[PDB]
Amino acid sequence: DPGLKPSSLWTHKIIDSIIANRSLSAVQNFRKQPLANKLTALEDAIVQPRKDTTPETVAAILQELVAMGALQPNEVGPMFSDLMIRVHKYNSTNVQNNLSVLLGDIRAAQSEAIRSTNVGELSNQVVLNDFLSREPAVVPQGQHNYEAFKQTLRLMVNEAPNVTLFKSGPDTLMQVNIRGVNTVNLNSAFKNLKNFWGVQLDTEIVPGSISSKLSSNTRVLLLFLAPFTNDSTFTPDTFISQIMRLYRETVAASI
Amino acid sequence: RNAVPNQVTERKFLVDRYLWQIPFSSNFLNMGTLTDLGQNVMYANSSHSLN
Does residue A61 contact residue A102 with C-beta atoms inside 8 Å? yes
In angstroms, rounded to a whole number, what is the distance separating the alpha carbons of residues A139 and A90?
56
Does residue A57 contact residue A103 with C-beta atoms inside 8 Å? yes
Q: Which residues of A touch B31 (CB under 8 A)?
A: none
Interchain CB distance below 8 Å, A39 and B40: no
DSSP state of A52: -
Q: Is A14 exposed, middle or buried (0-12, 13-18, 19+ CB in 10 A)?
A: buried
| Minimal CA separation from B22 to chain A, in Å | 22
Distance of CA A83 to the CA centre of its chain: 34
Handedness of CA A21, A25, A31, A37 (dihedral sign): negative
Phi-psi region of A165 (alpha: psi -120 to 50; beta: other; left: phi over 0): left
A170-194 as b/e, with b when 16 or more CB fall inside 10 Å? eebbbebeeeeeeebbbbebbebbe
In angstroms, rounded to a whole number, what is the distance separating the alpha carbons of residues A197 and A142?
5
Q: Is A68 exposed, middle or buried (0-12, 13-18, 19+ CB in 10 A)?
A: exposed
Does residue A82 contact residue A90 with C-beta atoms inside 8 Å? no
Does residue A56 contact residue A99 with C-beta atoms inside 8 Å? no
In angstroms, rounded to a whole number, what is the distance separating the alpha carbons of residues A124 and A113?
17
In angstroms, rounded to a whole number, what is the distance separating the alpha carbons of residues A245 and A226?
7
In angstroms, rounded to a whole number, what is the distance separating the alpha carbons of residues A20 and A225?
36
Residue of B31, B33, B34, B37 to mutate, testing the A interface (most A Cβ within 10 Å of its Cβ):
B34
CB half-sphere exposure, A127, CA atoms < 13 A: 22
* Helix or strand (DSSP H, E) at A131: helix A123-131
Q: Which amino acid is at A92?
A: S
